[PDB]
Each structure stands twice: as C-alpha cells, then as structure tokens.
Symmetry: C3
Subunit: 158 residues, 3 copies
C-alpha cells in the first residue's frame, strides 16, 4: 500500500512552501542581473557573490537590531514598540485617503452624467437644460467637504 | 479524533502559502533593507513607515488604475485595449529572440564538431579535413535564409 | 468520493505555491510601481512595457548566457561552478563574522553585568568593586581579539 506513503507526501507538499523563502533572494539577483525598470548586465558573474551573502548577513540584521553602540540591543526590543507607536500617530491618514480620493471620483462621473443627461433633456428645446444641470450639479458640487476631519478626530481623542 | 482531524490539518498547513505572498511585499523591503546590491541600510527605521504604508497604499495601485483622474479612469478602458493591441503586434519579437537563440547553439555546435572532426579527419597524407569543412559551411549556411521571419511576419500579419 | 477529490486538492495546493513564483516578475514592476523604496507618475503605461520584455529578454540573457566572444555559452555553465569553488575559499568569511557576532554579545553582557553587580557591591565595605570588574573584565578583555582565525584556517585549508 503506497497510498499511506502518499498520505505523508501530502504533508511534504506543505514543507515545499517554506522552500520558497530562498527564492526571494533569487528575485533580488534577477533584479540586479536583469536590469532595473521594465526590461523594454554582465555582472551576473559577480551576482554569484549573493551566495557569499551568508558572510555579510550578520551586518544588515545586527546593524539595526544591536547597532554599533552595544548594550542597546536589549534596549532595541523596547524601541520597536516606540517606532511603531511614533509612526502610528500619522497612521490615521487612512480616513484621509478615502474622503479626498472618493471625492474626485464623484467629480468625473458627474461630468459624464451632465453631458449625456443634459443632451437628452433638451428634446423640445425650451429650458430643460436648466433643471437637469442645476439638480445634478447641486448635489455633487455642494457635497464638497474640506479635509482636517482626521485632525479633529485625532485631537478629540488625544 | 485522528485521520479526520489530521486531514483538515493538511489544509491548515496548506493555508500558509497565501500568507507567504506577503513575502513578495517583504522582498521590496528586503531590497531597501539589504543594502540594494546583493547581500554580499539603517533606513529600516524608515521602513517602519510601511506599517503606516496603508495610508500610502491606496494611491500607488489606484493611480495606475484610474490614472491622474477618474475621467481618465474611463480612458484606462481604452488604453488597456491599446497596450495589448500595440504590444500584440510588435510583441512577436519574442520569436525573433528565440529564433536567434536557437540559432545561437546551432553555431556553437558545428564549430566544435569541425575542430574535432577536421583534426581527426586527415589521419593520413590526404586532405580529408577539406571534406568535413565544406559540409559544415554548406549545410549550416544553407540551413537558413537571408530573409528575416520577424520582419516578413510583421509586414504579412497586417 | 469527496475525500479523494479533496485529497488530490492538496496536490493542486502544491501547484498553488508554484503559481506564486510569477509574483517575482510582478515584484519587478512593483519596485517601479512603488516609486522607489516601498510607497512611503504616468509611467504605469511604462510598467505595461514589461509585456514588451519578451523582445528585451534577448539582450539581458544573451550577454550573460553566451557573452561577447563565442564558445562562452558552454563556458557560462563551467564558470558558474568555477566561481563557487574560487569564491569558496573566500566563503570562510562565514566564521569570521560569527566570532565578531558573539564577541559583541559578550560586550553587552560585560557592561550590563558589571554595572548592576558592581553598583550593589559597594554596599559592602572591603573592596568588592575590585573583584566584580576584574573577573568580568578579565574574561572579555583577555578574550577580546584572540587571533586571525580565518587567515590561519584558510591558509592551511587552501
């Protein structure tokens, strides 16, 4: 019975995913070795030095983590909370992006609707253009709401 | 519980590969955090902004999506056909690369065979090497044509 | 049935991780799409030029793969193995770094331990500060920089 042998094989496939993490460096090699901006480098001989990166690897990881002024490394565990906390103050910009961004969207559809609907509204040609443009333009145009909302929302809490 | 509990255990183990996709985002951070060139940058404190990157995040993906205006977003639908139509016609240069590339080893192979065959060919007071050399030039050279399929195809594919 | 259809599904999940590699080419586009370092212009049509990359692939790959002079294409496979062997001797930088890596860790422990232990030691009138600094300082100071490990081992091991 090989099915059971195949059953654990199902689990091995899970192991395969962890294998992928090394591929991430291969992409970096590809990045330097294949150019820069879209494809539309002789150095690949040197890019093989990526393998040698194992020697170099203490430098990128320890530099921030422990940093030259040793004794700080125990202090760094406390700084990571501070780095997130310090930047999180500005993180509210989330509310910022949808109010401004969504606002422009209302604007282009407004232009498309006013053109098509106004044209169809004329029909007889008396004064339909007045009611169609004023009503649609009144709701979208007046819907304008300046920024500073996040500032007030943040200030009220702290 | 055992096999049934173990079966779902397989998909639970399978679940991580979707989690793994963030590593693609990590590679971006890696490029900056790894000193740019292969692993053979203090700014990671700055990379901490990536947590806050959510604020930045709706602008880069959407900018390409809607362009510098939601009116232009209407334009994106037209250019999308444009990019594919434009690149579909000139894109055939793919064949040109692989056509030349196939040809690349074909040249290396006959040249190597000539060195070995030409030298062993004489094996007496006779000009046997003249025979292996003439066959090399006539067969390889005549195996192709002066006409470029890349150019002819672009002019005959409308 | 059901479980069997679902059993092979894991095998599809294995395919799913293989699917993920394509993201690496996307990451190239994303690097450009992210402005520069993560996310914290009109060129989105230029990122589309990645599709044009099929024609481009001849230029990055041909020079690296076949090089300028011919007969190099077989040479590319041999040199790749050759640089690993050549650079392997230099690969020993693996150990020089771990020695320095653990060495600084001794440093954070040395100043941290002496500061706390020596501070509490003054409570005793005799000369405790002498024994506290001398013992900690003796192990780190004397062990600091023992000798050239990589030079001696690399020179003997070629």
């Amino acid at each position: 019975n090989w099915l059971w042998y195949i059953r654990i094989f199902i689990i091995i496939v899970g192991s395969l995913i962890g294998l992928r993490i090394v591929f991430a460096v291969l992409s970096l090699v590809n990045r330097v070795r294949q150019g820069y901006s879209p494809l539309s480098e002789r150095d690949r001989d040197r890019s093989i030095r990526l393998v040698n990166g194992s020697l170099a690897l203490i430098w990128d990881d320890l530099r921030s983590l422990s940093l030259f002024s040793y004794h700080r490394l125990r202090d760094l565990l406390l700084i990571v909370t501070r780095i997130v906390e310090l930047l999180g103050r500005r993180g509210w910009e989330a509310l910022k992006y949808w109010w401004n961004l969504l606002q422009y969207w209302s604007q282009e559809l407004k232009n498309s609707a006013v053109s098509l609907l106004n044209a169809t509204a004329i029909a007889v040609g008396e004064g339909t253009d007045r009611v169609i443009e004023v009503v649609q333009g009144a709701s979208r145009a007046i819907r304008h709401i300046p920024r500073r909302i996040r500032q007030g929302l943040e200030r009220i809490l702290l």
